[PDB]
Design a binder for this molecule. Structure first.
Ligand SMILES: Nc1nc2ccccc2[nH]1
Lengths: 255, 1042
C-alpha cells in the first residue's frame, strides 16, 4: 500500500508536471539526495513542490514530524488545509487523483492506435484551420488598406474634376467665341473621361467591400470550427494519456 | 478481401505560400507595357503608355511633350517646377522625389501619377520615406497614433540616439571608421593549446600586400611575426621589408619607417574588414580562422585617407516631433474588477453547453487564487455584469502586476480567446475606469485555460472577441510609491523583524547560520533554472537573503522565493537588488526571461550587461536579447535603451539588430513596438540606412519573383521556370536592384554583379533561388571570386537559425576549454515571414550524392565503403590522416550536439561531407523532439546514428570498426564533449527560455525546454550522466559503448 497508494508514483520532475498539466486547484501526487519524497500540489495553474523529510522513523514537512508514515501524512491533509504549516497555502489536498477494463493487453494497445490516429488526424485539421485563420486575417487587413487606398485614389480624382472646373470654366467665359464648340468639345471630352473613370473606381471599391464581408464571413466560420475542434482534441488527447498509462518500446508501433 | 468491402462514401478525388503582393495592387509583376493616367495641374488626364521599367525622369519628360497636344497647355509651368505624387499600396500619398526611381519600383496601388508643385519646402525632411521603406510601414502611420506611451517613446528615445551619435564623432575620422568597420575579434586573447601548437613556437607567416601604380600590379611582403603582435607592429615590418635598400643606411631606414607607419591601416584582403585597434593579431577572427584552416593571412596595406575617403558624414538631425495623487499604499480595499460583455464569440451552440470568463492576477506566477465568473447566457450574447473579487489588498499589488483573462467553454474546460493587461500603466499609474480588450486566439501548443506568458495588451485586429470591463475608481489617480518611500518601508520592516520574539521566529523564519546551511545554499545556487524550487527551499532562501549577497549567483532563485504579493518582502528585495553584486551576463540574461518582470530586477540585469557583456558576446546573444523585448511591460525601458545605443555604436550589431526586428514586423504582437524601435535606429544610424535600403529592396524583388514561381509558374517544367527566372533578372530594375549591395548574411561581403549563368532554381518544391555574385573587392581572388547564397521563400528559417546559433556556441565552449571538435554553423538568417538567406558551403555534398557517383551500374545495393573511397580520392598521402581526424572530430561534435538538441532524424540527404573531410548537418527540422508531441512519452532519441559508412571512415578501412583505437579515441571525444555542454547547461536553458517570446511552435512553454534536462541528465550526478549517455548511445547502435 506504501507503493500501491494510488497517488504514489515513485517518475521525474517532467512527467509529474505533464500529469499535473490542465487539472484544477487542489490536485496532487507524490514523488533525490536533497531530501526524500516530494508532494507536488497544483494551485491555480501552477505547481507547488513540498518536501517530505524522513529521519528517526517519522515523516513530515519540517518540525511537526509526528506522522509515522508517508501514507499517514497525506490522509490528514486530504481532509485539511496547508495554511497552518506555512501561512499562504490556504488550499486543501482535495483531488488525490491517480476505461473498458480490456484486460486483453493487446486490445488496449490497438485502441491506443485508433485514438492516436484520430488525435493525429484531428491535430492536422486544427493546424490547417489555424493557418486559414492567419491567412484570412492577413487577406482581410490587406483588403482594408486596399479600400483606404481606393478611397484616397478617389479623393484625388474627385479633386481632379473639381480642379478642372476652376480652369476649364475660366476658359469658357474668358473667350467663348474663339474655339467655341472646338476647344470646349475637347475639354468636355476630358471631363466625361474623368468622371466615368471615377465611376469605374467607385465600382471597384464596392466590389472589394462585398468580397470583404464574404471573407469576414468565412473568417467567423473558421474560428467557429476551430473552437469546436479544440475540446474534442483535448478529451481525445486525455483518453490517449490514460490508455497509455494503464498499459505501462513495443508501443512505437501503435503510435 | 482487402478492405472488408467498406466504402468511404465521403472521399472524393477532386511548399506553403503566404499571400503578400507587390509592384501593383493584385498583380505581382506589372505588364512590360502599361497605361498610366497622369493627372495634370490644369485638370487634364493624359494617359501615357510607359514601359514598366521607365524612370520618372523619362515619364515626366514624355508627359510634358504629350501635354502640349491637349487643351489648356499654357496653364502649365516648366516641367522642372513639378513632382509626381500617387497613392501607394500602403494607402498613403507619397511624393516621388528620387525621379531616377522606376515605375515598377514605386509600389503604386493603381497605375497613375499626379503632377504637383512640391510642398513641405524641407524636401530633406520628407526623406522619412527612406526610414519607412527600411521599416516596411510609413512613418506618418506613427504620427497619427493617439496612445501617449507611443508618442512618449518616440520623443524620449532620441536621448539615446543623440548620445550615440556623439560617441561616433568624438575622435573623428577614426571613431567613424571604428563605428562603420568595428574590429572583428574573439572575446579572449589567450589562445587555446591546440591553436598555439599549430603555429611555429608562437609565430605565423603572414602576407602583406601593397599597390603603387596604376593599381594593376600588387606586391607580396611575406612576414613571419609573433602571433600576439599588434596591427601597428605588422605595418612596420611590412614597410621595413618594403623600403630596405642598398641606397639606404640603417638610420635612414628607421626614419623613413616612422614617417610611413601611421599613414596606413590593415585590411583583410577580399572583404570589408579591418584591423583598427590594439589587439593581438590572434584575437582577430580572420587570423584565428587562417590558423585553424591551415592558411596564410592575406592582409592589405591601406592608406588611411583612401579609407576615410569612403566614409560619409552622418548629419544626424533631431526629427520634427521635438501631480499630487494617492499612493497605492493608502488605498484601503481588496482588488475588484468588473467583467461586462463580450461581443464577438464564435461558437457552435450545438457543440457548447456554456461559457464563462476566467481571470487571475499574475507576476509570471500568480499572486492569489485564480477566479472565474458565472456561466451566463452561454454562447448567445454573453454578458455578465459581475465584480470579480480578488483576495489581495491593493497595496500588495507589485509594480509588474498583470491581469490575465480568458473566455472559456464547458469537465469540458476549454479556452476560446485570451488577453492580458498591465495593472499599472507606463507612468506608474494603477489602472482605473473602463477598458476595451480585443483578444488573441489560443495558440497551437497551449491547452491551458489562461495564458500569462502571452503578450500584454489588446490584439490590434478589430474583428476578434472584444471583452470590455471595468476597474475600480478611488476618486483619484492612484500611483505606485517612490523608491525613497519603498526604502523606508524596508528599513522599518527589517528592524521590526529584529524585535519579533524567538518563539514566533519558530514559523518559517540566527545571527550566525549553520555550516550545513551555509553549504546547502551554494548547492541550490548551482541548480539549473528548470529544477523547480520547493516551498521549504523558498522559505529557507528568503530567510537567509542577507547571506545570499555572499553568493551573488543565487539571485534568480532568491527572487522566485520572494512573495510578490507581500509589499513588505518586495520592498526589502528592492533594497537587496539595489546593490547586489553584478553577475556574469550568461546568468543575468535569465532575469530578462518572462519569469522576471519586475523593473528593478531587469534594470539590475541590464547593469550586468553594461559592465561585462562585450560587443563580441552581445552579437552572439543578440537574437535572444531582441526577443526578450517582448516581455518588457512598456515601450521605454532600460533594455531597449541599452540595445539601441549598442546598435548605433557598432555597425555590425546595428546590422543584425535591424534584420532581427525587421524580420518579425509581420507578427502583430510586436509590429508596433519593433516598428517604433526600427524608426529610432533608422533615424540615427547614419549612412547605413542607404545601404540597408538596398538590401531591403533586393529582398523585396526576390520575394515577388519567387512568389510568382510558386503560384503561377508551377505545373511548368524546370526548363520553363528557369527561363522565366533569367528573363526577369535581365530586366533593368532587377539588374539595378540585385547588383550593388552588401549581403545580409555578412555585410563585410559586398555583392557585385550577378553571374546569371551560375544562378538557378534548386530542385526543391519551395523553389529556392541559388544566386551568384561577383566579389567586387580588389583582392577578390585572394579570398573568393564568387559569393553565392540561397534565398528561400517558403520555410520558416528561425528554428534553424536558433539551432545553428546553439551549435556556434557549443563549439566556442568546447574549443575555448581546449578540445577541438569542428562544427560548421553555416549562416542562416530569417528576414521575413518564412523568407530567408542560407550561406552556401562550397565543396560539400550530401552523403547520398557521394553514394550515387560511386554506385556501380547494377543497382544491387549501395556500398558502405564508397564514402571512405570518395574521401581517399580527395585526400591522398599524409593529407589523408588529418582528413580522417577532421571527419572524426566533426562527427563527434555533431553527434553530441544533435543528441542534446533532439533534432530531426539524420539520414543520407541531410548529412554532408566536405572534400577536406569535414562532416556537417543541414535542414534540422524540429529541434526539441517536437514530433514527440504526437507520442514521445520520454523517447530520448538518438538522431545521428552512425551507420557503417561513418564507422568505416573513422577506423581507416578496418573490418569490425567497433573495436579499434581510432574508435576508442572517438568515444572519448563524445564523452568529453557531452560533459562540457552539461557544465554549461544553465546557459542553454536560458537561451531557450529567452526564445519563448517568438511564435515558434517548438517553444511554447518551459516544458518544451524540459527535453534538454533529460538529454543532459541534470537531475542525476555527472557519473550517472556519463553512463546515461553511454546507455543511450549503446542502444541506438546495438553494441560498442561500455
Ligand atoms: N555572428 C552572427 N550572428 C548571426 C545571426 C544570424 C545570421 C548570421 C549571424 N552571424
Amino acid at each position: 500500500s506504501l507503493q500501491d497508494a494510488e497517488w504514489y508514483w515513485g517518475i521525474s520532475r517532467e512527467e509529474v508536471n505533464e500529469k499535473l498539466r490542465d487539472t484544477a486547484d487542489g490536485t496532487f501526487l507524490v514523488r533525490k539526495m536533497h531530501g526524500d519524497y516530494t508532494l507536488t500540489l497544483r494551485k491555480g495553474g501552477n505547481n507547488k513542490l513540498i518536501k517530505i523529510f524522513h529521519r528517526d522513523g517519522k515523516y513530515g514537512f519540517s518540525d511537526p514530524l509526528t506522522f509515522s508514515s508517508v501514507v499517514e501524512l497525506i490522509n490528514h491533509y486530504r481532509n485539511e488545509s496547508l495554511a497552518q504549516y506555512n501561512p499562504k497555502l490556504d488550499v486543501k489536498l482535495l483531488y488525490p487523483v491517480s476505461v473498458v477494463k480490456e484486460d486483453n493487453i493487446e486490445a488496449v494497445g490497438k485502441k491506443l492506435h485508433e485514438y492516436n490516429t484520430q488525435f493525429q488526424e484531428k491535430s492536422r485539421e486544427y493546424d490547417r484551420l489555424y493557418e486559414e485563420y492567419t491567412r484570412t486575417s492577413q487577406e482581410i487587413q490587406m483588403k482594408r488598406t486596399a479600400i483606404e487606398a481606393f478611397n484616397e485614389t478617389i479623393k484625388i480624382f474627385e479633386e481632379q474634376c473639381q480642379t478642372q472646373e476652376r480652369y476649364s470654366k475660366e476658359y469658357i467665359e474668358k473667350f467663348k467665341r474663339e474655339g467655341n464648340e472646338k476647344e470646349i468639345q475637347r475639354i468636355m471630352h476630358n471631363y466625361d473621361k474623368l468622371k466615368s473613370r471615377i465611376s469605374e473606381i467607385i465600382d471597384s471599391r464596392r466590389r472589394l467591400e462585398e468580397d470583404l464581408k464574404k471573407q469576414a464571413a468565412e473568417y467567423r466560420e473558421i474560428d467557429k470550427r476551430m473552437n469546436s475542434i479544440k475540446p474534442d482534441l483535448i478529451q481525445l488527447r486525455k483518453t490517449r494519456d490514460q490508455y497509455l498509462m494503464w498499459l505501462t518500446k513495443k508501443l512505437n508501433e501503435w503510435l | 478481401s482487402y478492405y472488408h468491402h467498406h466504402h468511404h462514401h465521403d472521399y472524393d478525388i477532386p511548399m506553403p505560400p503566404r499571400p503578400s503582393s507587390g509592384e501593383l495592387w493584385g498583380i505581382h509583376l506589372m505588364p512590360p507595357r502599361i497605361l498610366v493616367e497622369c493627372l495634370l495641374p490644369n485638370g487634364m488626364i493624359v494617359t501615357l503608355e510607359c514601359l514598366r521599367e521607365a524612370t520618372l525622369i523619362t515619364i515626366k519628360h514624355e508627359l510634358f511633350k504629350e501635354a502640349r497636344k491637349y487643351p489648356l497647355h499654357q496653364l502649365l509651368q516648366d516641367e522642372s517646377s513639378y513632382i509626381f505624387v500617387s497613392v501607394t499600396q500602403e494607402a498613403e500619398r507619397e511624393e516621388f522625389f528620387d525621379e531616377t526611381r522606376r515605375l515598377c519600383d514605386l509600389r503604386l496601388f493603381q497605375p497613375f501619377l499626379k503632377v504637383i508643385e512640391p510642398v513641405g519646402n524641407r524636401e530633406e525632411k520628407i526623406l522619412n520615406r527612406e526610414i519607412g521603406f527600411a521599416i516596411g510601414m510609413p512613418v506618418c502611420e506613427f504620427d497619427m497614433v493617439k496612445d501617449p506611451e507611443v508618442q512618449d517613446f518616440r520623443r524620449n528615445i532620441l536621448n539615446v540616439c543623440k548620445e550615440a551619435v556623439d560617441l561616433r564623432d568624438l575622435n573623428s575620422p577614426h571613431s567613424r571608421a571604428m563605428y562603420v568597420y568595428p574590429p572583428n575579434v574573439e572575446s579572449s586573447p589567450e589562445l587555446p593549446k591546440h591553436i598555439y601548437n599549430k603555429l611555429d613556437k608562437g609565430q605565423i607567416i603572414v602576407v602583406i600586400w601593397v599597390i603603387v601604380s596604376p593599381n594593376n600590379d600588387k606586391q607580396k611582403y611575406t612576414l613571419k611575426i609573433n602571433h600576439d603582435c599588434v596591427p601597428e607592429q605588422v605595418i612596420a615590418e611590412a614597410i621595413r621589408k618594403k623600403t630596405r635598400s642598398m641606397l639606404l643606411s640603417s638610420e635612414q631606414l628607421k626614419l623613413c619607417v616612422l614617417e610611413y607607419q601611421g599613414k596606413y591601416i590593415l585590411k583583410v584582403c577580399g572583404c570589408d574588414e579591418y584591423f583598427l585597434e590594439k589587439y593581438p593579431l590572434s584575437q582577430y577572427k580572420y587570423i584565428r580562422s587562417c590558423i585553424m584552416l591551415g592558411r596564410m593571412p592575406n592582409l592589405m596595406l591601406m592608406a588611411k585617407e583612401s579609407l576615410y575617403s569612403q566614409l560619409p558624414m552622418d548629419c544626424f538631425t533631431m526629427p520634427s516631433y521635438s501631480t499630487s495623487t494617492k499612493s497605492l499604499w493608502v488605498i484601503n480595499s481588496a482588488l475588484r474588477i468588473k467583467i461586462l460583455c463580450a461581443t464577438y464569440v464564435n461558437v457552435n451552440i450545438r457543440d457548447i453547453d456554456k461559457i464563462y470568463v476566467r481571470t487571475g492576477i499574475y507576476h509570471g506566477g500568480e499572486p492569489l487564487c485564480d477566479n472565474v465568473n458565472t456561466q451566463r447566457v452561454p454562447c448567445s450574447n454573453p454578458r455578465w455584469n459581475e465584480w470579480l473579487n480578488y483576495d489581495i489588498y491593493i497595496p500588495d499589488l507589485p509594480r509588474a502586476a498583470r491581469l490575465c483573462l480568458s473566455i472559456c467553454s464547458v469537465e469540458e474546460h476549454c479556452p476560446l480567446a485570451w488577453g492580458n493587461i498591465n495593472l499599472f500603466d507606463y507612468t506608474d499609474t494603477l489602472v482605473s475606469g473602463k477598458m476595451a480588450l480585443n483578444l488573441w486566439p489560443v495558440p497551437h501548443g497551449l491547452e491551458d485555460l489562461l495564458n500569462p506568458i502571452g503578450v500584454t495588451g489588446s490584439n490590434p485586429n478589430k474583428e476578434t472577441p472584444c471583452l470590455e470591463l471595468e476597474f475600480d475608481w478611488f476618486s483619484s489617480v492612484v500611483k505606485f510609491p517612490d523608491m525613497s518611500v519603498i526604502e523606508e518601508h524596508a528599513n522599518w520592516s527589517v528592524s521590526r523583524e529584529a524585535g519579533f520574539s524567538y518563539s514566533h521566529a519558530g514559523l518559517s523564519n540566527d545571527n550566525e547560520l549553520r555550516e550545513n546551511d551555509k553549504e546547502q545554499l551554494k548547492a541550490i545556487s548551482t541548480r539549473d533554472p528548470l529544477s523547480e524550487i520547493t516551498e521549504q527551499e523558498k522559505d529557507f532562501l528568503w530567510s537567509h537573503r542577507h547571506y545570499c549577497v555572499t553568493i551573488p549567483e543565487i539571485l534568480p532563485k532568491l527572487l522566485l522565493s520572494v512573495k510578490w504579493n507581500s509589499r513588505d518582502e518586495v520592498a526589502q528585495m528592492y533594497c537587496l537588488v539595489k546593490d547586489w553584486p553584478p553577475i556574469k551576463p550568461e546568468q543575468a540574461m535569465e532575469l530578462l526571461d518572462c519569469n522576471y518582470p519586475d523593473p528593478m530586477v531587469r534594470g539590475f540585469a541590464v547593469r550586468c550587461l553594461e559592465k561585462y557583456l562585450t560587443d563580441d558576446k552581445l552579437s552572439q546573444y543578440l537574437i535572444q536579447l531582441v526577443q526578450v523585448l517582448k516581455y518588457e511591460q512598456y515601450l521605454d525601458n532600460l533594455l531597449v535603451r541599452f540595445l539601441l545605443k549598442k546598435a548605433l555604436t557598432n555597425q555590425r550589431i546595428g546590422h543584425f539588430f535591424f534584420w532581427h526586428l525587421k524580420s518579425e514586423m509581420h507578427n502583430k504582437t510586436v509590429s508596433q513596438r519593433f516598428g517604433l524601435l526600427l524608426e529610432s535606429y533608422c533615424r540615427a544610424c547614419g549612412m547605413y540606412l542607404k545601404h540597408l535600403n538596398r538590401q531591403v529592396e533586393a529582398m523585396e524583388k526576390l520575394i515577388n519573383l519567387t512568389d510568382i514561381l510558386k503560384q503561377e509558374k508551377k505545373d511548368e517544367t524546370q526548363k520553363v521556370q528557369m527561363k522565366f527566372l533569367v528573363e526577369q533578372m535581365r530586366r533593368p530594375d532587377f539588374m539595378d536592384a540585385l547588383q550593388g549591395f552588401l549581403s545580409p548574411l555578412n555585410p563585410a561581403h559586398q555583392l557585385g554583379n550577378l553571374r546569371l549563368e551560375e544562378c538557378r532554381i534548386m530542385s526543391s518544391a519551395k523553389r529556392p533561388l541559388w544566386l551568384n555574385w561577383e566579389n567586387p573587392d580588389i583582392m577578390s581572388e585572394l579570398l573568393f571570386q564568387n559569393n553565392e547564397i540561397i534565398f528561400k521563400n517558403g520555410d520558416d528559417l528561425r528554428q534553424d537559425m536558433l539551432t545553428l546559433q546553439i551549435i556556434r556556441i557549443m563549439e566556442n565552449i568546447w574549443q575555448n576549454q581546449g578540445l577541438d571538435l569542428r562544427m560548421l554553423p553555416y549562416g542562416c538568417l530569417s528576414i521575413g515571414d518564412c523568407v530567408g538567406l542560407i550561406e552556401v558551403v562550397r565543396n560539400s555534398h550530401t552523403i547520398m550524392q557521394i553514394q550515387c557517383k560511386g554506385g556501380l551500374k547494377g543497382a544491387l545495393q549501395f556500398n558502405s565503403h564508397t564514402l571512405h573511397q570518395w574521401l581517399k580520392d580527395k585526400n591522398k598521402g599524409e593529407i589523408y590522416d588529418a582528413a580522417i581526424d577532421l571527419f572524426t572530430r566533426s562527427c563527434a561534435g555533431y553527434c553530441v550536439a544533435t543528441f542534446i538538441l533532439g533534432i530531426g532524424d539524420r539520414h543520407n540527404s541531410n548529412i554532408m561531407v566536405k572534400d577536406d573531410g569535414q562532416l556537417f548537418h543541414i535542414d534540422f527540422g524540429h529541434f526539441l523532439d517536437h514530433k514527440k508531441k504526437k507520442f514521445g512519452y520520454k523517447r530520448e532519441r538518438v538522431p545521428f546514428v552512425l551507420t557503417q559508412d561513418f564507422l568505416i571512415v573513422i577506423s581507416k578501412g578496418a573490418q569490425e570498426c567497433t573495436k579499434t583505437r581510432e574508435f576508442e579515441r572517438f568515444q572519448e571525444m563524445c564523452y568529453k564533449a557531452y560533459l562540457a555542454i552539461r557544465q554549461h547547461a544553465n546557459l542553454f536553458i536560458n537561451l531557450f527560455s529567452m526564445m519563448l517570446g517568438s511564435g515558434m511552435p517548438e517553444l511554447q512553454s518551459f516544458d518544451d525546454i524540459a527535453y534538454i534536462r533529460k538529454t543532459l541528465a541534470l537531475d542525476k550526478t555527472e557519473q550517472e550522466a556519463l553512463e546515461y549517455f553511454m546507455k543511450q548511445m549503446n542502444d541506438a547502435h546495438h553494441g560498442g559503448w561500455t
